[PDB]
Amino acid sequence: XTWEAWDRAIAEYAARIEALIRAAQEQQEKNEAAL
């Protein structure tokens, strides 16, 4: 119930990180258009 709103924070940093790695891949795949 600290462990559920811990479980809150992780799943909702985890879902920041995916949609940054989102951006980074979808810039990477602009970069391979130099290569």
């Binding site: 924070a9 990180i17 940054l20 810039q27 990477q28 970069n31 130099a34």
Partner: protein
């Protein structure tokens, strides 16, 4: 812009760094329940979590500054060296994060060994997965170190723009791999919390 990308790479590392602290918090709680002190590895873990957290804080801090500086020079169009420095930075941050993953993984491994069968409820897959991702990231770090060194010389002479682009990819993939690693340590803690709390 590679500069903007590097900012997302930095930012990602930060989020992962918070995620990581959340797991240390997680492991600390379990450790209290299951364990009779810093005996058998634990005060060293404790101390080394800190010695690495502090090094990483300081690394994010140097990166944030290289970042602002890179951004201020996007119109001066000479700053190959700044981007390459930023790449060096991010690499250094990724490795320290790795050391930290490695400690948490060890943490969980210790705790699980005392209270669950490692052949039950998803723990065999967990071991393999852990172990693969570890070897995968080590390889990506190795390759990144190799790429850095190279870029740093390509930058003397004519363009080595492809190697910067390549390197971005390198760092990008090591972060995705730490992210899996992270997910796996969340899974483990979640199992241990379920069993003993």
């Amino acid at each position: 812009g590679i500069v903007q990308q590097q900012n997302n790479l930095l930012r990602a590392i930060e989020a992962q760094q918070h995620l990581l602290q959340l797991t240390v918090w997680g492991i600390k709680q379990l450790q209290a329940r299951i364990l009779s002190g810093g005996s058998g590895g634990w005060m060293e873990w404790d101390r080394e979590i800190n010695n690495y957290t502090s090094l990483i804080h300081s690394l994010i801090e140097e990166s944030q500054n290289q970042q602002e500086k890179n951004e201020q020079e996007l119109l001066g169009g000479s700053g190959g060296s700044g981007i390459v420095q930023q790449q060096n930075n991010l690499l250094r941050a990724i490795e320290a994060q790795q050391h930290l993953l490695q400690l948490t993984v060890w943490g969980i491994k210790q705790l699980q060994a005392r209270i669950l069968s490692g052949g039950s409820g998803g723990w065999m897959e967990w071991d393999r997965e852990i172990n693969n991702y570890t070897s995968l990231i080590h390889s990506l770090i190795e390759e990144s170190q190799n790429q850095q060194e190279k870029n740093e010389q390509e930058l003397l002479g004519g363009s080595g723009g492809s190697g910067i682009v390549q390197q971005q990819n390198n760092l990008l993939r090591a972060i995705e791999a730490q992210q899996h690693l992270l997910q796996l340590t969340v899974w483990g803690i979640k199992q241990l919390q379920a069993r003993i709390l």
